[PDB]
Structure formats: structure tokens, C-alpha cells
């Protein structure tokens, strides 16, 4: 039995404003999962979901809604796991360290022979701290689904900042209907509104 405690994505924190943290908690007595926060304030209505999957293992995850203002002042949220000798606990909180806003760069790949109806849009986001970064792709002023793009895990630059790449394949029908795509980065150091953007097109 092992457990993990997630952080709120910058997208959930500053765009949706409805951030949440989820206690993963990956068998005779059902396992109880409760929440606590360092300030002593009450825990919101935490919704717990039990999943019977898959290879002879049980998954019980609890999602706890948190407040965006609370997370900024350094509120520590702790999750505890009890079974019918000792309990396991994970604690999540705002990352420490300096803040650095991201630089955002967008590029389009040239036409590749045989694949004329598809293109690849690449977004470089770099020199930001801390590493927590959300990426969304906008087309027609409407955000594209998340499954459409792929973002690499943050990695350290030669400086103290982190960088991330985002890759998005687009179809001809899309860029011909409107040849403009926006790669948006959500980071708490971005000012104002925690957003840095760049537009790209396919020629």
C-alpha cells in the first residue's frame, strides 16, 4: 500500500479558479481516508471514489476541493490513511523558491511528404520557476481538448529555471478554417493574470 498527494494544476488554480487536490491511495477492512489542513480550517466536502481495478489491486482516491487564495498563502493540506498499526500521511503545499515567469515560443513544422493533411505545432515554455506549469492550446478562441496535445515533463535549464515543450498535431481542415493557433502557459509568476501566450500559423 502506497499513496500520493497531487498538487493543483496552475490551470485549475488561475483559469478555472476551482482547484482540487486528490489523495491517490493506491484488503479485509475498507480503508478510511480523511483530510486536514495546517491552519485548522475545516475541510470542504471531499468526494471519495472507490475503483475496483485492476490486476488484483484496489484503488481508492479522494478529491478535495481547495480555495485558490488559500493555496497562495502557503496552506498545507495533509491526507491520512487508516486501516482496521500505523497510518500513512501525505502533505501537499505551495512550492517554495523564487518565482520566474515563463517565456513562450510557438513553432510550426514544415510539410512532410506523404502527410500533407497534418501538421505539428510545437510550443517551447522555458526559464520559469517553480516547475508547476499548465499548457492549453486555443483554436478559434475555444480551448482544444487536453488529449489533443502532449506536454513534456518540466526539466532543468542550465540556469535555475525549468523548461517544457508542448506538441500539438493539427489537421488541414482546422488551419484552413482559421490559420491561427494560440499556445497559452499558466504560471503563478506570469503577470498579470498568470498567463503568457504566443500565436503560430501554418503557411
Amino acid at each position: 500500500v502506497s499513496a500520493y498527494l497531487s498538487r493543483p494544476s496552475p490551470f485549475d488554480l488561475f483559469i478555472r479558479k476551482s482547484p482540487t487536490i486528490t489523495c491517490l491511495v493506491v484488503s479485509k477492512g475498507t480503508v478510511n481516508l480523511t483530510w486536514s489542513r495546517a491552519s485548522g480550517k475545516p475541510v470542504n466536502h471531499s468526494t471519495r471514489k472507490e475503483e475496483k481495478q485492476r490486476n488484483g489491486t484496489l484503488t481508492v482516491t479522494s478529491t478535495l476541493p481547495v480555495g485558490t487564495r488559500d493555496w497562495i498563502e502557503g496552506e498545507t493540506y495533509q491526507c491520512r490513511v487508516t486501516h482496521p498499526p500505523r497510518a500513512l500521511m501525505r502533505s501537499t503545499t505551495k512550492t517554495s523558491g523564487p518565482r520566474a515567469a515563463p517565456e513562450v515560443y510557438a513553432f510550426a513544422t514544415p510539410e512532410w511528404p506523404g502527410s500533407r493533411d497534418k501538421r505539428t505545432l510545437a510550443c517551447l515554455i522555458q526559464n520559469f520557476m517553480p516547475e508547476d506549469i499548465s499548457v492549453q492550446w486555443l483554436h478559434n478562441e475555444v480551448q482544444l481538448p487536453d488529449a489533443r496535445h502532449s506536454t513534456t515533463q518540466p526539466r532543468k535549464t542550465k540556469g535555475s529555471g525549468f523548461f517544457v515543450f508542448s506538441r500539438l498535431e493539427v489537421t488541414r481542415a482546422e488551419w484552413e478554417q482559421k490559420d491561427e493557433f494560440i499556445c497559452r502557459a499558466v504560471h503563478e509568476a506570469a503577470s498579470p493574470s498568470q498567463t503568457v501566450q504566443r500565436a503560430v500559423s501554418v503557411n
Partner: antibody
Amino acid sequence: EVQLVESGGGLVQPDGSLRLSCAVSGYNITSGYSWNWIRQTPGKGLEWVASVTYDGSTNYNPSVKGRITISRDGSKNTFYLQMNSLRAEDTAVYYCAKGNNYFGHWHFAVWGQGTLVTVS
Amino acid sequence: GSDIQLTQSPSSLSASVGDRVTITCRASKSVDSDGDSYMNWYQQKPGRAPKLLIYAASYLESGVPSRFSGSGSGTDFTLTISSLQPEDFATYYCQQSHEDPYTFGQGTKVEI
């Protein structure tokens, strides 16, 4: 970050009354966490005195209950400790400390410099 | 009188840099509850205020060196230091957060 600065300590006569203050900076005491008073007799052990939470709830150590009281001033972001009927047992260094909650049980994460109260 | 009383051992000890030190804390009543033990450990160097090293008996406060480790349960708790350092010459207190009023040990003084 949170910094606690005590004041109001000094020489005091028995049966008198003294008021100690803790000036908090970097965090508003009405926002959360517990705010406690813990005294130490020099050369001896440490004892918890009283606590006020961010909601105004007060909790006292029964060994001092009835003579002492803990107050809060949100506008000045300061909480106080009024002592009455001082005794030689009360001579001690008085720290204030911020309390972090862990499932209904508090630990003293940040402590002030402490101010000395001496009765004769 | 009805309080939980905390007794530490040893009261004082002399050590050298690099030594491994073990301090014990005994409680009148069990401070265990809900699968956790509400015993906290504090370090106090001379002339300064105590500092939190461990809470819940095993968890280390952020920024505390890894050499400090807590163990125990019920009425028996042990603060362990893997290797002693010059800045560790201080008094070490345990504190139970199970019942009001919160109480402290007498303190274990470590002299380098």
C-alpha cells in the same frame, strides 16, 4: 514568512497584573492557525499557558485558569496575555508561538524571541 | 494532576561530534489516537527559543536536517540523531498534543 515579537516583560510585584503582547508579521492571526503562549522558568522545563485560534476560541491551561486571560486584536494583528495575581511560580520567560493543526492536534511551528517576566 | 506527564532520558549527556545520540520520552498515558502518536520534538539552543524538529513523532518539519528521526508509539518515544553536529548542542524537549493541557518533558541537554 511569520515573525513573532513579544514585549511587555519586566520586573513585577506579587499580586500585581502584567500584560504581554505578541506582534505578528507576515500573516494575519484572524486568517488561521492557533496562537499560543508558552512560558519557561529559566533552568527548568517548558509549560503551555493559553491559546486563541483564528476564530476567537480560547483555551487555557488549568494550572493558570481563573487568574490569566488571552485576548486578540485583529486590527493590530496582535494577541495579548493579561496576567493577574502574580506569583513566584509565574516568573518565567514567556514565548508566543503559532500552532499548526494536524487532524485536531496542534504543534508549535514558529516561536518568538520570548520576553522575561520576573516577580519578587 | 490528571495531565499527561512526560519523562525524558537521559536528563543530560555529553557527546562528541559524529556520535549517535538517542533520547527517550515516556508518557503517563498513551498519546496514540487514530493510528497516529501526537508526540512532537523541539530543539532549543541556549538563549534562543525552541524550534520544532518533529511532529506526530515521526514526521520532520520542513527544513529540518534528515539526521533527526522520530520513532515510537503509545507511551514510548525516541528522538534519534544519526550523527551529531556542533550546532546540535541544545536541550531537546518532547511534547504531547493528545490531550489538553499540552505538556512537555523536562528536556534532555546535549553537551558537545
